[PDB]
């Protein structure tokens, strides 16, 4: 007489042997990311433009190192011009169609890949200056600095060129998203082909440079301490490398775990539910890095704001 079956509600979930209620974690992050990303964009824009004004007119880019420092600030700007879009993408959705999405996605990675590429070039230029002083003088022409940078930008474009194969956007889920739909027939190949490229080029390669180059540089510290300015100059290039590692290597580790939820790593869904709150934080930490390099220049750098270090203390 009183039957309790009247419910039109349904759940968009498949049938498995372990029910996993995965939380969207978009709204809580949408009340934290747009003001933070805007604050990064405020500090980042006025930060790097000062580093462009000072080197162009106050320093004079008289050397190959200053050329790489300029290009590193330009690489950060390519990162920065996409930041207000992603600020307005956690908050609501993707309102920009797709024709511009094959450019913005590329500009994100051109900012990313060239970012580590010129830091490596900064490391190699300072390594050559300390150990192979005869060889470095022949090859540290500003002319040679420019043509190296031009090649470096081209490679940075090609390092994002598989990402530009498909950027089509369709309404899937709540609102239109611009998710690259690479070919289905060779699906397993391309998916694994993307995790390694960020990790090798962005983590493995600069680690290999750091081991090799800073073992040759520290050898000078063991021999003599006669020149303080040579020791103090290494402090600038060393700080840039490790602050990059402090802010991007947590993402690189998690990015390997994101694809490898199979037998290689961890299989529990609750292990992937803590991981759902891990990928976004370390990506956000990476996002903040683009404003840190001018801040480093005002603290470590004894050529830009060296009088501010005495005035602060």
């Amino acid at each position: 007489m009183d039957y309790q079956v009247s419910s039109p509600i349904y759940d968009i979930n498949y049938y498995t042997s372990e029910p996993c209620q995965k939380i969207n974690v978009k709204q809580i992050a949408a009340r934290l990311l747009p003001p933070l990303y805007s604050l990064v964009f405020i500090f980042g824009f006025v930060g790097n433009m000062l580093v462009i004004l000072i080197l162009i007119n106050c320093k004079r880019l008289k050397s190959m190192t200053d050329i790489y420092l300029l290009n590193l600030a330009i690489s950060d700007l390519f990162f920065l011009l996409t930041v207000p879009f992603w600020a307005h993408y956690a908050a609501a959705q993707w309102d920009f169609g797709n024709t511009m999405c094959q450019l913005l996605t590329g500009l994100y990675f051109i900012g990313f890949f060239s970012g580590i590429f010129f830091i490596i070039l900064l490391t190699i230029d300072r390594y050559l200056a300390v150990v192979h002083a005869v060889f470095a003088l022949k090859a540290r022409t500003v002319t040679f600095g420019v043509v190296t940078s031009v090649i470096t930008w081209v490679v940075a474009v090609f390092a994002s060129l598989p990402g530009i194969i498909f950027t089509r956007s369709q309404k899937e889920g709540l609102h239109y998203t611009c998710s690259s739909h690479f070919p289905y027939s060779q699906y397993q190949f391309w998916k694994n082909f993307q995790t390694l490229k960020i990790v090798i080029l962005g983590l493995v390669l600069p680690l290999l440079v750091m081991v090799i180059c800073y073992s040759g540089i520290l050898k000078t510290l063991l021999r003599c301490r006669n020149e303080k300015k040579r020791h103090r100059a290494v402090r600038l290039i060393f700080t840039i490398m490790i602050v990059y590692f402090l802010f991007w290597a947590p993402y690189n580790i998690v990015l390997l775990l994101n694809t490898f939820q199979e037998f290689f790593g961890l299989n529990n869904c609750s292990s992937s539910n803590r991981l759902d709150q891990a990928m976004q934080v370390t990506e956000t930490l990476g996002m903040t890095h683009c404003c840190i390099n001018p801040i480093i220049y005002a603290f470590v750098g004894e050529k830009f704001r060296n009088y501010l270090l005495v005035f602060f203390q």
Partner: protein
């Protein structure tokens, strides 16, 4: 193993028997298929050497709507659905007794809603052709007339020991997998002009049907970059309870054009007008078949709209929908099921019959013929299969 012996020659007096028959199907006993599990615990292997003794000059009045053999199959398939799809919530009504003292008020409002909670594993599901065989002492007759009229006497009576391939497929508005007609599409009904008995229409040509769901619910695009956290890959984007069928219009139009010719001869030159059904339960208004726990409820309004006139001569998109909470054809009540499963489900089925009702009236003027789709009474589903046979007991003098 089983074994029975023939009868070289017997034509004694025939008497209608109501004995208990044993099934005989070709099982496998190794797979996780339910119909192979049920046939292993209760069915025997099929007869490798069947014998059909043809009786030259013998006639009998095969009534088919009073057949007690179909009342046994209907109680043998209900015993399979209690071993195949265990419902999560089996809500069934339960009343006791409330009367006053036909002369005194008949207000019976005392009824209890008993609910049973069981585990719901999504298991495989596929029918298997079975053979009902006669027990010791009885025999099963079989006509061989190509028309057979329903409840009419034939002349080519032959006796057998086991029936032909019978599938336990449960469906409404369109009879699925089964036997075809011999030479012409025939119609069967207990009484015409009754406007109450369903009209069984058996086809002579198999109309094919492919019912599948597209695997585009799960996303395969990866937003590798700024996002890759919220909209991450393998996230459901589509409806997981939606499918679609297709019917060959160039082939189905031929078979339907032969149905209207039979009706014209039977009902004296009327205007056959098919229509959609008049409402009711969603297992009656729509089509209903099963494929691995996926209970397709197919909208057939773009299949029965068309009206007909004389001088008669590609991919009909049939919109279906998987509903969890389904009515049980076995008695009253409902049964809530489990969420659907991961993968492509394809129903490469057949269409052998057609269940049709009739809308006759005397308020409506002299000529009209409305044939809405009916069915739902599963006893009528297997009366379309057990029409050739009859269980009769022949006493032995020995």
């Amino acid at each position: 193993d089983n074994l029975w012996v023939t009868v070289y020659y017997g034509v004694p007096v025939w008497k209608e028997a109501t004995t208990t028959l044993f099934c005989a199907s070709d099982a496998k006993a190794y797979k996780a298929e339910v119909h192979n599990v049920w046939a292993t615990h209760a069915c025997v292997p099929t007869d490798p050497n069947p014998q059909e003794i043809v009786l030259e000059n013998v006639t009998e009045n095969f009534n088919m709507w009073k057949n007690n053999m179909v009342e046994q199959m209907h109680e043998d398939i209900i015993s399979l659905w209690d071993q195949s799809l265990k419902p999560c919530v089996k809500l069934t009504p339960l009343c006791v007794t409330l009367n006053c003292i036909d002369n005194t008020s008949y207000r019976l409002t005392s009824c209890n809603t008993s609910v049973i909670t069981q585990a719901c594993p999504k298991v495989t599901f596929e029918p298997i052709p079975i053979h009902y065989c006669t027990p010791a002492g009885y025999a099963i007759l079989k006509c061989n007339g190509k028309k057979f009229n329903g409840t009419g006497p034939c002349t080519n009576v032959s006796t057998v020991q086991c029936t032909h391939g019978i599938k336990p497929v449960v469906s409404t508005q369109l009879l699925l997998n089964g036997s075809l007609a011999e030479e012409d599409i025939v119609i069967r009904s207990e009484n015409l002009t009754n406007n109450a008995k369903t009209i069984i229409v058996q086809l002579k040509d198999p109309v094919d049907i492919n019912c599948t769901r597209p695997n585009n619910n799960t996303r395969k695009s990866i937003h590798i970059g700024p996002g890759r956290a919220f909209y991450a890959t393998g996230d459901i984007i589509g409806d997981i309870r939606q499918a679609h069928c297709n019917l060959s219009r160039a082939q189905w139009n031929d078979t339907l054009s032969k149905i209207v010719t039979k009706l014209r001869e039977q009902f004296e030159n009327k205007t056959i007008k098919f229509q959609p059904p008049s409402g009711g339960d969603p297992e009656i208004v729509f089509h209903s078949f099963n494929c691995g726990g996926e209970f397709f409820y197919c909208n057939t309004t773009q299949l029965f709209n068309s009206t007909w006139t004389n001088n008669t001569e590609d991919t009909i998109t049939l919109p279906c929908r998987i509903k969890q909470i389904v009515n049980m054809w076995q008695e009253v009540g409902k049964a809530m099921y489990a969420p659907p499963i991961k993968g492509k489900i394809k129903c490469s089925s057949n269409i052998t019959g057609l269940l049709l009702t009739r809308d006759g009236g005397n308020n409506e003027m002299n000529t009209t013929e409305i044939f809405r789709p009916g069915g739902g009474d599963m006893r009528d589903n297997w009366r379309s299969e057990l029409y050739k046979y009859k269980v009769v007991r022949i006493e032995p003098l020995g």
